[PDB]
Design a protein around this ligand. Sequence first.
Ligand SMILES: Cn1cc(NC(=O)c2cc(NC(=O)CNC(=N)N)cn2C)cc1C(=O)NCCC(=N)N
Ligand SMILES: Cn1cc(NC(=O)c2cc(NC(=O)CNC(=N)N)cn2C)cc1C(=O)NCCC(=N)N
Lengths: 255, 255
Amino acid sequence: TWLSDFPQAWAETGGMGLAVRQAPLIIPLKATSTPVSIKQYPMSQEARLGIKPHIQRLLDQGILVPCQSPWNTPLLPVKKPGTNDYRPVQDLREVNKRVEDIHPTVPNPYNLLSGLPPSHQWYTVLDLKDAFFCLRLHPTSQPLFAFEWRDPEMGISGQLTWTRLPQGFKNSPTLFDEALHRDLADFRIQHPDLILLQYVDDLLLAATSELDCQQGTRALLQTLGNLGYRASAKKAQICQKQVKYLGYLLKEGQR
Amino acid sequence: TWLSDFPQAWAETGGMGLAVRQAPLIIPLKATSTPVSIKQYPMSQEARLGIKPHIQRLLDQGILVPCQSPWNTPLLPVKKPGTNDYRPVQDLREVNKRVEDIHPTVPNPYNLLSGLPPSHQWYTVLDLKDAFFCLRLHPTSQPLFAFEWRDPEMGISGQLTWTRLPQGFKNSPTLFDEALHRDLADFRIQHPDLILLQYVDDLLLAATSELDCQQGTRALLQTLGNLGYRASAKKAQICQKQVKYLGYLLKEGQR
DNA sequence: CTTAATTC
DNA sequence: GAATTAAG
DNA sequence: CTTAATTC
DNA sequence: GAATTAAG
Ligand SMILES: Cn1cc(NC(=O)c2cc(NC(=O)CNC(=N)N)cn2C)cc1C(=O)NCCC(=N)N
Ligand SMILES: Cn1cc(NC(=O)c2cc(NC(=O)CNC(=N)N)cn2C)cc1C(=O)NCCC(=N)N
């Protein structure tokens, strides 16, 4: 039972993650940047009610906190399908434009897979849940991502902001990838015979045999949980000779 | 008096031209071409009355003649300005597409003028009137350019066609330029010290002195008239140190 | 909603 | 230019 | 008028 | 795609 053996490693049973070994991130602004405060376009009650549960959960989790900031960006009413299903989506484009660029270090899937040797055909694929949220944001950089929030009655003071790396921020993917690489460096050293591919929050572990993959997967899950990351048990593909990774179906050494 | 000295050379007094030394032109068709007969779109009476005088003049001049041809292209109602002023314009595009291409030998004005030496600053500019019409078309090629014509009453039988190189034909400019070059070859040989630039029907004669330009112009006018070409006396610029040629103003060796 | 490149 | 698409 | 590339 | 331009 992979589930009961690693309670801390799975998002379903280990609680929200927090990368304890990573220092809170400081987000450098471009040399000429000054705060921008964009007005929140009026949100319908339907949208507000749909978003409310998520905001409260994030507040309870400490991922969102009240604040007064010179920065402010819009929250928009999203619902891809059309019937119900709401989720808060922040338009951080004006913030992104004022943040210093960093080199794009995440490899494209095609090149990443070129590092998969035919000798290793036993795989385990894991995707980390709420990955960006596991990385803390330094208090100095938190004001940057503020947005407005309120309830027709006893609504929050005014603004709320993120204490963790947020969705919609241009550097989140790269910063997360680099952080996890730092945290998994030792694991790679302790398991020289295993192949570990990282694409932001999507991991592929490859071994030469089922046994090696089993032992390697136990070690990786143990390490991820200890570091504060959380993998999706529901979507995990453990020790299979056929797996779906980054849109590809890895089979018979193909793809 | 340049006018009375060369009666035959000027269009105003020498009658319609005819290049007597040039064999009637045969127009080769592409290897897969077959005749195309395009219907004449109904012409308003206003247009017909405006065009009629020109058709009659051309018929009287023998430039247009009755015919029965498998080829037929449209005549359109033209009048650039808007009030009156009509002229027959034939849409020969479907004929052009079926005629074999020839190398474009007419130089562009820019390069043509590069052959004008600073040593020759006395000029004479002449433009030949109804130049294309001076070149006969071989009877075998005449049917190619047929079009319909008629009068609400005793109108012409049906079709009319050209016995001379027509306007709107893709190769007329090049064929005329080459023909005149053949006819003026001897003149160039007899006058080595003169510079003669030809751009289809626009000629520029350049000499080192007023006297040389005067003598050269007399010889050129005499030669052109004898060959059957006709220059516009109204637009002629004779022995001037400043002239307008091909859109350029030639002055102080400039342009 | 807003900012914007794609198509037509 | 206006409609269609994309994405924060 | 018809055929067509340019712009918007 | 529709209006604007060009040219036989
Ligand atoms: C890939 N892509 C195709 C499109 N749009 C289309 O393909 C497209 C545009 C149209 N437009 C019309 O039909 C216009 N009709 C009309 N004016 N009568 C029809 N289609 C199928 C937009 C984008 C796109 O990426 N847009 C977002 C660019 C960005 N802001 N980064
Ligand atoms: C050089 N040139 C410019 C144009 N047209 C334009 O410049 C032009 C096109 C438009 N179009 C519009 O305004 C369209 N408006 C709209 N659909 N609401 C405005 N202008 C100024 C056409 C040609 C041209 O050469 N056409 C003939 C090509 C040929 N058939 N050989």
